[PDB]
Design a protein around this ligand. Structure first.
Ligand SMILES: Clc1cc(CNCCc2ncc[nH]2)ccc1-c1ccccc1
Lengths: 326, 326
């Protein structure tokens, strides 16, 4: 008849039991403050529908980050703002400080706490096996919190994780794709960045949950311990599933899609092939062995599962032996 | 002639901004189609506008439609520009659309719907706290619009829509609002009689945002003392006399001397001599529950003849009267 329904094993009804105002971002009233209080200093980068700037709040001489949004979709701006407001103050969540709009331009801008970022590549060289544990625990704090608040980030990747290694501070940012979890709801699968996309998205299984973020986090952990960036290197969304199948095997992939009665896209049949399930110790080499341990591999194995229901939740992951040292 | 004056705050916000932001005469107005809106009932009738509750048929959401009698096109452009400039500001009525009826070609402004609680029910059950709360909400609107270089120039109870059930307040009716430019001489035929600042009544044209602070003072006094209106003039000359009966003729002569104001000969036989009355004189059994030393200290700092001596909206927000509000 169609796909088998699914629901989160944790924080299932947190949004249902809350008032309409909290989860309805379309009805949320956005109060745009004056942009004069902020003086833009330099461009920090340029995203798809946003330009980020380092700025100074002239009213208190404090550094801030200003994300000038290309207002391509209003509903999307409202969702992000609402989620940021909802999560404001949460552990390791980027703090939205202000919502402003420049008076002639009338372009929406989000003002955040400033983070002194340590480069992905630069941090990578000096990252110890403990450091991977510590920061992975810090991300888990952010995820367990946002999941407990009925929100799935849906865009977990190293670019969205800001780290100040000098102060051992981590912030989960870029909430633009984030969404309110509602049990039974069917979500758009065109979320997350290709390498971090969960199997559910690639096979077009819409009734996904917070566990999506746990797959993404698994991909990040895999890339870190093994020093293989990205871990699953798809060249497109179809190939992405093949790259996962080359590691997890095609047997468990068919068991997954059968369990949820998923109609596999015709473009898959000719590229998927047949693949054995690979051991996690196969990726261990001389360049990465110092960051790899049985605990790390046991933890990774419990994150990188086809079955979204079978993956550890953020809270279960926090209790894993891998983190006994943090 | 009269000594020049300028605002103590947001003096050159407009000057340092481009021509497009404040030249409303050059602003390009794009009139949408009125067919998206179905009028429900008349909410009231102003001088050059008729307001209606309406339904946006494309989304079944209620909206407010202000049909404007097009006596002057320059004024309509000014309002539209100001509304567009302020759109999204805290407690500012949100302009949602600008439409013309296809056959009538009459200009109409579409705003976000506000459910206004019945004034009579609200007036009797209002408490000391509700006044502090709603006053702070108006201050948010004023500090914001003054920050954007705009003086409302028509602050009065009628232009403050309050939804008590949801504790929502909107400052509306921007038809008399104007861009502040330091040194500019404005038309004094603005605001509503009871709310007209001394500067308007003595024909002192170089006024600023502080005009709105006097008007707010009139509302506050009316609220805490349960006297409506507080200064009950029967005309614009008598209006100054009503103020003089409270503030005293001594300070009135100090004011007009400070700015070298030529007092109209019509004031000669009506002004008289009046002593400075203590604010405690207006306290009675019917209003003593809404009055406090903080309230009287705050009111005293708003109802000043000298427009430069009145608290700015930001200073007013920092007053001890609001120490009990978020
Ligand atoms: Cl300003 C005002 C206004 C109202 C209601 N205004 C009615 C506005 C209206 N009615 C129809 C169209 N617009 C109620 C209370 C207040 C008020 C509340 C606290 C302190 C001072 C004043």
């Amino acid at each position: 008849s169609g796909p088998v329904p699914s629901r989160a094993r944790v924080y299932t009804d947190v949004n249902t039991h809350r008032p309409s105002e909290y989860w309805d971002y379309e009805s949320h009233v956005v109060e745009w403050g004056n942009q004069d209080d902020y003086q833009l200093v330099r461009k920090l980068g340029r995203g798809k529908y946003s330009e980020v700037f380092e700025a100074i709040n002239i009213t208190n001489n404090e550094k801030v980050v200003v994300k000038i949004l290309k207002p391509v979709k209003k509903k999307k701006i409202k969702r992000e703002i609402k989620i940021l407001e909802n999560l404001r103050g949460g552990p390791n969540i980027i703090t939205l400080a202000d919502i402003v709009k420049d008076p002639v331009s009338r372009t929406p801008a989000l003002v955040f706490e400033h983070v002194n970022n340590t480069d992905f590549k630069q941090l990578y060289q000096t990252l110890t096996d403990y450091d991977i544990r510590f920061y992975m625990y810090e991300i888990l704090k952010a995820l367990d919190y946002c999941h407990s608040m009925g929100i799935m980030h849906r865009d977990v990747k190293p670019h969205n994780v800001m780290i100040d290694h000098e102060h051992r501070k981590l912030r989960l940012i870029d909430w633009g794709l984030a969404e309110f979890y509602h049990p039974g709801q069917e979500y758009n699968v065109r979320v997350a960045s290709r390498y971090f996309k969960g199997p559910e998205l690639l096979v077009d299984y819409q009734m996904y949950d917070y566990s999506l973020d746990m797959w993404s986090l698994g991909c990040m952990l895999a890339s870190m311990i093994f020093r293989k960036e990205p871990f699953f290197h798809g060249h497109d969304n179809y190939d992405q599933l093949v790259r996962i199948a080359k590691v997890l095997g095609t047997e468990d992939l068919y068991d997954y899609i059968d369990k949820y009665n998923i109609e596999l896209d015709p473009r898959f049949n000719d590229i998927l092939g047949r693949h054995s399930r690979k051991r996690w110790e196969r990726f261990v080499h001389s360049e990465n062995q110092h960051l790899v341990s049985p605990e790390a591999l046991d933890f990774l194995d419990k994150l990188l599962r086809y079955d979204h229901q079978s993956r550890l939740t953020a809270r279960e992951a926090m209790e894993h032996p891998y983190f006994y040292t943090v």
